[PDB]
Design a protein around this ligand. Structure first.
Ligand SMILES: CCCCCCCCCCCCCCCCCC(=O)OC[C@H](COP(=O)([O-])OCC(O)COP(=O)([O-])OC[C@@H](COC(=O)CCCCCCCCCCCCCCCCC)OC(=O)CCCCCCCCCCCCCCCCC)OC(=O)CCCCCCCCCCCCCCCCC
Ligand SMILES: CCCCCCCCCCCCCCCCCC(=O)OC[C@H](COP(=O)([O-])OCC(O)COP(=O)([O-])OC[C@@H](COC(=O)CCCCCCCCCCCCCCCCC)OC(=O)CCCCCCCCCCCCCCCCC)OC(=O)CCCCCCCCCCCCCCCCC
Ligand SMILES: COC1=C(OC)C(=O)C(C/C=C(\C)CC/C=C(\C)CC/C=C(/C)CC/C=C(/C)CC/C=C(\C)CC/C=C(\C)CC/C=C(\C)CC/C=C(\C)CC/C=C(\C)CCC=C(C)C)=C(C)C1=O
Ligand SMILES: CCCCCCCCCCCCCCCCCC(=O)OC[C@H](COP(=O)([O-])OCC[N+](C)(C)C)OC(=O)CCCCCCCCCCCCCCCCC
Ligand SMILES: NC(=O)C1=CN([C@@H]2O[C@H](COP(=O)(O)OP(=O)(O)OC[C@H]3O[C@@H](n4cnc5c(N)ncnc54)[C@H](OP(=O)(O)O)[C@@H]3O)[C@@H](O)[C@H]2O)C=CC1
Ligand code: SF4
Ligand code: SF4
Ligand code: SF4
Lengths: 176, 55, 342, 49, 155, 45, 318
């Protein structure tokens, strides 16, 4: 099924030629273009008053990363290195070691936020929902080094955006 | 921020069509952002028998 | 060496050189180059600054991430100097000013500030302090720039014994205020050479040569306590040197002879400007004064470097000053001027 | 019939924002003048409408 | 007082600077598409005084949006050196920040920093058009805290 | 309970138009010229 | 009391273009569903001042291949020509009652193009010379229609004095007797001032610059303020020439209010068409005038030489 987009032949009767001539001299399609720009002038602009009116997002939004912890308080990451193994840009570096108490966690968990592609593959691979991408997207910085997060900064994010990340996965865990 | 009828007549005539019917801005017809939890179905192979991977 | 200071790599940006420099006044002519040379080898340079952070932006893309650290310091504050030099291997002094600011005269910035830097560095426990002073540093020269420099280097020597002291003759480079200063004199009618500049003898030294000279001094183990003197290979008479500048710049030459006392007056007239002064009386004395040869002090060559003649790197500075009629002229069109025996 | 209502609605905003002084405060610091119901208040002082 | 006079004068200049930033679009990769959405009426970059203007002789800030390929690296430096220089550089996206996805490639420089000095860094892949608006807002704050006249008065 | 996923309404969504909706407006050719000439005649007088 | 008069014209003129740049974006934005500047001051009422102050404090620089003298004088040519041209405009009573006011504005407006290519030629840039050569033949070809359109309309005046338009269209607007010439007059004004059905002089899409190629804070501000001032007038000249207004000799304020309103409405239309049409290619804009505007231009001229004679309506010379 195809349609011929431009195969219209104008009529040669005395009426049609005059209308085309009237269109030519008395610019009409130009007025129609003008007339519609006036229509948009009186309409309702769609601009949102940033930062007083932030844009609409979804619970699945991928932003700044953070390591969450169990309700008890102990971290969720058990250093399985799934997130590091599946990271498409190799932005994850992990070093683990037996903790003093037994059950062992990472001693180094660095995310290179200038090498990250924010694909979210880390939060899917994680079998304990430890590493997640938080809702924040306003962590722009003045220096390149401030982007290169390590375990401490990421753990701080987990203790800062927990009130929001907990609700997001609460609304989205059933889909996954 | 739905405008005065005087503008609506002028705005409609300037464009040549009824603009109040279909608008570029979503007022309330959007779906609520807090939706009830879903119940995802299962795949055809979610069977307890006669579901050997070799087949 | 500390466990974290052992050199590593192949000298690139990510290579660990092993020297923690603290280049003072790096937001300037030599400060730009010395940071760069330290930046290439991968050295954590603690650059202190008192100017606007914007004026230090050009310094940022010269080292790997986390290498170049910017700190706020004030000249008349021991605490600021201590803060910047507390963790350092080498401290480089490059504070200087060709004019006397309202809050800072030649005494303040060439003796007082180097005194505080040297004294605090010894208390901090740094290894090497590289202090820079003019080659023409002298206690009796009327130009307070040379007079202040001579007092400062002696004082720095007293406070810091094993502090290498560099005595460059006159740097020339992209922003040198030496070749640019003479090239900028076209606006003021003709060039008013003092006594036609037939007696002043100068030995300009390339800026890059000085920069690599400082870096070689840092890695050299014998630089402790020595007093180097950086001079260019050739030695030029003032009139012929200005001839080479204006010939390379292809600008008209008007050798105006002007009496010394009159020149001191016009230097006073240009001194009144609150902003960056075009020239001062002390500047007039400096260009009028010659660069005495000091063979006893070790030269630039002793720091495993070869000097670069001005006639080799002349178009670098004066290509900008050329108009469109001569913006595309070659390098060898103008031959070197008269070379008085060195 | 609607212009007079529009002016009254526009005039109502000065009473909505705590008088004229508050009106310039929002205009000069928030770039809007629209009034809206207060949905809540947080601990740091941000007013959500 | 002289310091007070220089204080108000500096604020007047800094206000005139931060209230008019004219980006010189270096649209390179998918980071540029999101930036145009900032120019789209949803966020309306123009409303903040900041409006897109070509001819780097008539622009104030660079917005590096996309990967910086080694072949074009001289072009980035040349168009950076030609800006009348109260000037700032905004890096959009992980690729422009430090290489991002192509950090390990043979023909992508690991970050736009190695060519030009970089002001505020905008992380993302791509950073949403709202995130860039926050970035430009951060530069306006940075311009607000400039003491150019105060430093000159205390030189 | 039973499976619950995003689904179309039981009767299906309403029609969604796609064809061109360019309207025809304005007087015919002769009428435009006539009023254009008529204005000149009155203006001339 | 003449320096006060002149400075009562220069300052309002420069302030008119000053906030025309605000009513540009704030109108352009609203026509493209944006909102325009509303951050700097209330409703953007301070944005141009922020723009202007920046454009007199950010580093200016002459090009390395420039011609200094011609590079500097071109902004002088643009700004002085724009200001001096408002002089004989007959807002109730004109500032300078030239006997040949129409011919004066034609002559100097034909001079405002020496700025554009003296800037282009001295800049020594490939895009500069292209834009300069685009603009010159653009304006002069559009100037032939400009001269004849003015003459044909003014044949009912009886003179070139700008004050007599008030008397000429006392009862009837001039457009009702010369509307065919009014259409090409408006198009030519869009073309001499380089607005954007024919903004090819700038040519930002294909020439990035051309109004001001390497021109910087100061000189760029001039070449902008020298063409936005022409925007306001070329509609003030259109308003005074075609859409007359009642002028009571005892209360000129009513005429000034009416005259300003017509210029404001016309200026909006200049901004209105600017965001409703594509860009004319060079040969097209030349073909439109040399092959379609000029044949109608001469024909309607011959009509307006004969028309007063056949109707015995020769206007008074005095
Ligand atoms: C031609 C212009 C004539 C004057 C303006 C008339 C006008 O458009 O009034 C708005 C009014 C409604 O406009 P709308 O876009 O339909 O309003 C949509 C919402 O109701 C809009 O909802 P909203 O809640 O945004 O409306 C409130 C709004 C309402 O604002 C107004 O009504 C402004 C105009 C009156 C003041 O007031 C404000 O937002 C407060 C700030 C006002 C800004 C400054 C206004 C300056 C006006 C001109 C001053 C002199 C120059 O216009 C009309 O009803 C048509 C007027 C036609 C006049 C023809 C004259 C010949
Ligand atoms: C008719 C009289 C023409 C007089 C004349 O020689 O005009 C040369 C004048 C400058 O030529 P250029 O190609 O710009 O080359 C200037 C430098 O030689 C090449 O560029 P530059 O960077 O050397 O320009 C600075 C230069 C030349 O001075 C200037 O650029 C200042 C303005 C022009 C002064 C003459 O300053 C000096 O030579 C020292 C001035 C003390 O060319 C003109 O077309 C100006 C005519 C002005 C007539 C009156 C207009 C009212
Ligand atoms: C393709 O298409 C394109 C266009 O369009 C077709 C375009 O538009 C544009 C333009 C782009 C845009 C519109 C986009 C957005 C960009 C902007 C808005 C840029 C803004 C630019 C500006 C220049 C800002 C303008 C804004 C303002 C507020 C200007 C304000 C003006 C001033 C501050 C100055 C006002 C004047 C003053 C103060 C005059 C003072 C005068 C006096 C005191 C008196 C002087 C005179 C005397 C004293 C006389 C007496 C003296 C004597 C006699 C001396 C005698 C001496 C002797 C020696 C004898 C582009 C690029 C384009 O691509
Ligand atoms: C109408 C405008 C009203 C306000 C105008 C204020 C003056 C602005 C001039 C441009 C900025 C420079 C200035 O003010 O002083 C120059 C002074 C000149 O001395 P400076 O040494 O500070 O210059 C900057 C530093 N160098 C020289 C290394 C580039 O500079 C500054 O103030 C910038 C710091
Ligand atoms: N031919 C020559 O010029 C020679 C010079 N030298 C010495 O080299 C040094 C640097 O020269 P150069 O780079 O050309 O000089 P510049 O004037 O270009 O730079 C001087 C540097 O010192 C800083 N500085 C100066 N005075 C003060 C002060 N009072 N408080 C804080 N910082 C200050 C400047 O900061 P800021 O930029 O903010 O002003 C800048 O970083 C000087 O000691 C000079 O005497 C040695 C041999 C030859
Ligand atoms: S979202 Fe970032 S950190 Fe996570 S897997 Fe993808 S690239 Fe790696
Ligand atoms: S995937 Fe989760 S549990 Fe595994 S190493 Fe990464 S953060 Fe730790
Ligand atoms: S950071 Fe991501 S979005 Fe931006 S250019 Fe690179 S791959 Fe594209």
């Amino acid at each position: 099924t195809y349609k011929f987009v431009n195969m219209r032949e104008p009529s040669m009767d005395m009426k049609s030629v005059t209308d085309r001539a009237a269109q030519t001299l008395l610019w009409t399609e130009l007025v129609r273009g003008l007339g519609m720009t006036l229509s948009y002038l009186f309409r309702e602009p769609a601009t949102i008053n940033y930062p007083f009116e932030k844009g609409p997002l979804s619970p699945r939004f991928r932003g700044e990363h953070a390591l969450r912890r169990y309700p008890s308080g102990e971290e969720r990451c058990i250093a399985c290195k799934l997130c590091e193994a599946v990271c498409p840009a190799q932005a994850i570096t992990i070093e683990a070691e037996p903790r003093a108490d037994g059950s062992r966690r990472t001693t180094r968990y660095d995310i290179d936020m200038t090498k990250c592609i924010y694909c979210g593959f880390c939060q899917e691979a994680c079998p304990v929902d430890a590493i997640v991408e938080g809702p924040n997207f306003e962590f722009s910085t003045e220096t390149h080094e401030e982007l290169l997060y390590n375990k401490e900064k990421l753990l701080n994010n987990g203790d800062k955006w927990e009130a929001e990340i907990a609700a997001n996965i609460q609304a989205d865990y059933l889909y996954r | 921020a739905s405008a005065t009828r005087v503008i609506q007549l002028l705005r409609n005539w300037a464009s040549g069509r009824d603009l109040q019917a279909k608008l570029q801005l979503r007022y309330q017809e959007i779906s609520k952002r807090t939706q009830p939890p879903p119940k995802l179905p299962v795949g055809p192979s979610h069977k307890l028998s006669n579901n050997y991977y070799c087949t | 060496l500390h466990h974290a200071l052992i050199p590593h790599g192949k000298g690139g940006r990510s290579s660990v050189s092993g020297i923690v420099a603290t280049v003072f006044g790096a937001t300037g002519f030599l400060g730009r180059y010395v940071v760069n040379h330290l930046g290439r080898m991968g050295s954590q340079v603690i650059v202190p600054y008192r100017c606007e952070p914007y004026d230090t932006m050009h310094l940022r893309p010269m080292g790997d991430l986390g290498q170049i650290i910017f700190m706020e310091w004030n000249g008349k504050d021991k605490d600021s100097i201590r803060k910047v030099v507390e963790h350092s291997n080498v401290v480089i002094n490059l504070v200087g000013r060709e004019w006397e600011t309202k809050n800072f005269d030649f005494e303040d910035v060439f003796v007082k500030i180097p005194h505080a830097i040297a004294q605090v560095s010894k208390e901090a426990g740094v290894e090497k302090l590289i202090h820079i002073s003019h080659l023409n540093a002298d206690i009796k020269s009327p130009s307070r720039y040379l007079r202040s420099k001579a007092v400062g280097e002696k004082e720095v020597r007293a406070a810091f014994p094993e502090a290498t002291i560099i005595k460059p003759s006159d740097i020339f480079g992209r922003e040198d205020r030496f070749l640019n200063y003479f090239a900028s004199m076209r606006w003021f009618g003709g060039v008013p050479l003092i006594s036609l500049g037939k007696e002043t003898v100068k030995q300009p030294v390339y800026i890059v040569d000085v920069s690599k000279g400082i870096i070689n001094a840092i890695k050299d183990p014998d630089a402790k306590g020595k007093t180097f003197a950086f001079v260019g290979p050739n030695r030029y008479l003032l009139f012929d040197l200005v001839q080479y500048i204006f010939a390379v710049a292809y600008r008209p030459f008007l050798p105006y002879p002007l009496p010394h006392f009159a020149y001191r007056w016009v230097g006073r007239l240009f001194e009144v400007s609150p902003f960056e002064p075009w020239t001062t009386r002390d500047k007039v004395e400096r260009v009028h004064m010659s660069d005495m040869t000091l063979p006893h002090l070790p030269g630039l060559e002793d720091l495993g470097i070869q000097a670069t003649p001005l006639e080799l790197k002349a178009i670098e500075v004066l290509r900008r000053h050329r108009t469109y009629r001569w913006l595309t002229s070659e390098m060898e069109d103008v031959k070197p001027a008269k070379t008085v025996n060195i | 019939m609607e212009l007079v209502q529009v002016l009254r609605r526009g005039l109502q905003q000065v009473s909505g924002h705590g008088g004229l002084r508050g009106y310039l405060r929002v205009l000069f610091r928030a770039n809007d003048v629209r009034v809206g119901t207060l949905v809540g208040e947080d601990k740091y002082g941000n007013k959500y409408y | 007082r002289g310091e007070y006079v220089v204080a108000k004068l500096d604020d007047l200049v800094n206000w005139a600077r931060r209230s008019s930033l004219w980006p010189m679009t270096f649209g390179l990769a998918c980071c540029a598409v999101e930036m145009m959405h900032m120019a789209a009426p949803r966020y309306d970059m123009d409303r903040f005084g900041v409006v897109f203007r070509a001819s780097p002789r008539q622009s104030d800030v660079m917005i590096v949006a996309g990967t910086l390929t080694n072949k074009m690296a001289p072009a980035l430096r040349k168009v950076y050196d030609q800006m009348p220089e109260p000037r700032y550089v905004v890096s959009m996206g992980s690729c422009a920040n430090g290489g991002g996805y192509y950090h390990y490639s043979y023909s992508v420089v690991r970050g736009c920093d190695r060519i030009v000095p970089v002001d505020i860094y905008v992380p993302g892949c791509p950073p949403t058009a709202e995130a860039l608006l926050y970035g430009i807002l951060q530069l306006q704050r940075k311009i607000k805290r400039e003491k150019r006249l105060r430093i000159w008065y205390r030189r | 309970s039973k499976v619950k996923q995003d689904m179309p309404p039981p009767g299906g969504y309403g029609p969604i138009d796609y064809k061109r909706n360019l309207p025809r407006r304005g007087l015919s050719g002769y009428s435009m010229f006539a009023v254009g000439i008529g204005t000149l005649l009155f203006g001339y007088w | 009391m003449f320096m006060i008069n002149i400075l009562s014209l220069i300052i309002p003129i420069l302030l008119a273009v000053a906030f025309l740049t605000l009513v540009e974006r704030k109108v352009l934005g609203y026509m493209q569903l944006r909102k325009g500047p509303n951050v700097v001051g209330p409703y953007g009422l301070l944005q141009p001042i922020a723009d202007a102050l920046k454009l007199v404090t950010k580093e200016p620089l002459r090009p390395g291949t420039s011609s200094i003298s011609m590079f500097i004088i071109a902004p002088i040519l643009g700004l002085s020509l724009a200001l001096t041209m408002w002089v004989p405009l007959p807002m109730p009573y004109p500032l300078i009652n030239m006997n040949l006011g129409v011919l004066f504005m034609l002559a100097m407006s034909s001079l405002a193009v020496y700025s554009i290519l003296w800037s282009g030629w001295a800049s020594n840039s490939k895009y500069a010379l292209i834009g300069a050569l685009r603009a010159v033949a653009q304006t002069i070809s559009y100037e032939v229609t400009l001269a004849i359109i003015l003459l044909s309309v003014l044949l009912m005046n009886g003179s070139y004095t700008l004050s007599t338009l008030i008397t000429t269209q006392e009862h009837i607007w001039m457009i009702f007797t010369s509307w065919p010439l009014a259409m090409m007059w408006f198009i030519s004004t869009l073309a001499e001032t380089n607005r954007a059905p024919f903004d090819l002089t700038e040519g930002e899409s294909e020439l990035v610059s051309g109004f001001n190629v390497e021109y910087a804070a100061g000189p760029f501000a001039m070449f902008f303020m020298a063409e936005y001032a022409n925007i306001i007038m070329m509609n003030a000249f259109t308003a005074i020439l075609f859409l007359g207004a009642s002028h009571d000799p005892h209360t000129p304020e009513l005429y000034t209010i009416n005259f300003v309103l017509k210029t404001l409405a016309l200026t909006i239309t200049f901004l209105w068409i600017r965001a409703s049409y594509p860009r004319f290619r060079y040969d097209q804009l030349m073909h439109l005038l040399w092959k379609s505007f000029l044949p109608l231009t001469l024909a309607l001229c011959m009509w307006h030489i004969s028309l007063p004679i056949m109707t015995a309506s020769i206007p008074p010379q005095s």
